[PDB]
């Protein structure tokens, strides 16, 4: 084992990016490259240094001179955004590089869609209460979620995901606010407040509904 990769690389949409793999082992094994998008299985994009599988875009190419393998992507599109892994067979061992996360700048921004659900009567009857804030179709994938009881910020009780890519290159995320029944009924309202790229969306929900 050995192989070393850059953990992150960026490219402008349209520009060429080179992903470098440099572990020894390549020194004359022949290298494969795999693409992995989130929540998905790996695909081969380049095998034996230079060859490209039937359905891989022509803009994918590989190079390998002893030391170093290079995956080149010539005119980068939004959907080349994935993790890329280097592979080589030492002798009696398949070796993977630690992978490279490829970011494509600068795609157009998308504004978050925000849905807030109040606790169900069933959950309240089970003596618990969960507010559910759902956030979809936003790009870039960085949001800030803050909750408030009426207009006082609530600190304790909040669980928020980190944003994740969806089918259409955009992001989604969830925030959960766990309450006791009493504190759910004891305010006029609760609000999910989502900030994305300086803009803010606030959805509000009330026990008298």
């Amino acid at each position: 084992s050995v192989l070393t990769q850059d953990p992150a690389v960026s490219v402008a949409l349209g520009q060429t990016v080179r992903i470098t793999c440099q572990g020894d082992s390549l020194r004359s094994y022949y290298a494969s490259w795999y693409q992995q998008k989130p929540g998905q299985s790996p695909l081969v994009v380049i095998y034996q240094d230079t060859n490209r599988p039937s359905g891989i875009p022509e803009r994918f190419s590989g190079s390998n001179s002893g030391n170093t393998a290079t995956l080149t992507i010539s005119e980068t599109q939004a959907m080349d955004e994935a993790d890329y892994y280097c592979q080589a067979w030492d002798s009696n061992t398949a070796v993977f590089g630690g992978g490279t996360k490829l970011t494509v700048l600068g795609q157009p921004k998308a504004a978050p869609s925000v849905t807030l659900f109040p606790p169900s009567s069933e959950e309240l009857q089970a003596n618990k209460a969960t507010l559910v804030c759902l956030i979809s179709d936003f790009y870039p994938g960085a949001v800030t979620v803050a909750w408030k009881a009426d207009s006082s910020p609530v600190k304790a009780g909040v669980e928020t995901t980190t944003p994740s890519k969806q089918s259409n290159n955009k992001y989604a995320a969830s925030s959960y606010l766990s309450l006791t029944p009493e504190q759910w009924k004891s305010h006029k309202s609760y609000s999910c407040q989502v900030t994305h790229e300086g803009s803010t969306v606030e959805k509000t929900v009330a026990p008298t509904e």
Partner: protein, 215 residues
Amino acid sequence: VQLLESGGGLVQPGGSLRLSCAASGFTFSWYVMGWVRQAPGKGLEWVSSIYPSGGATNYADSVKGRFTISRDNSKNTLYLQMNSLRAEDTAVYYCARGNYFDYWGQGTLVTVSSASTKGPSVFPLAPSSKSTSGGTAALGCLVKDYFPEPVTVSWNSGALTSGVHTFPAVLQSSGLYSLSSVVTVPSSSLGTQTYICNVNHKPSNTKVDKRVEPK
């Protein structure tokens, strides 16, 4: 071309598991087959491979003496016996074909942990039109407090797929997961016609078909 892994789940440290991959769509006995695994948030790590015949072939040093790869060419099946499992072995385990790893299955999750499994409470999210665009409504299911991953959600036993969004789970402070699935349907059809969340948490052998009524 299909690689179908099976046999993953929750197991206690020191415990055993037998992973299984059933292949089809190609001539199984021509190919080196292999297992590659991926700890959550980590990279791809090669586990082991096996020649079309039976010699097999090396193992990653971290599983030598504990894991055994084998195959049954007459059942087109690849196997991975996992003994003396420890926390570090927690991963999605992928079945891959070939020296070049040209085909990967969807993988099976192995969780090695002391914590015991918990089934999820499933709460309905009554339809709302506040943030759906145009004469539609969003309704959903809250799948709260289960362990370990995963959970599958379907609507109306599979007959409803247009407009479904299942969100990726949160992992909470507690170590429990929760997620939500939301579906967008016509408001006109809000009551004639009915909506059922099918939730399934295999690790705890829980299923729940939750009817989601207008409030």
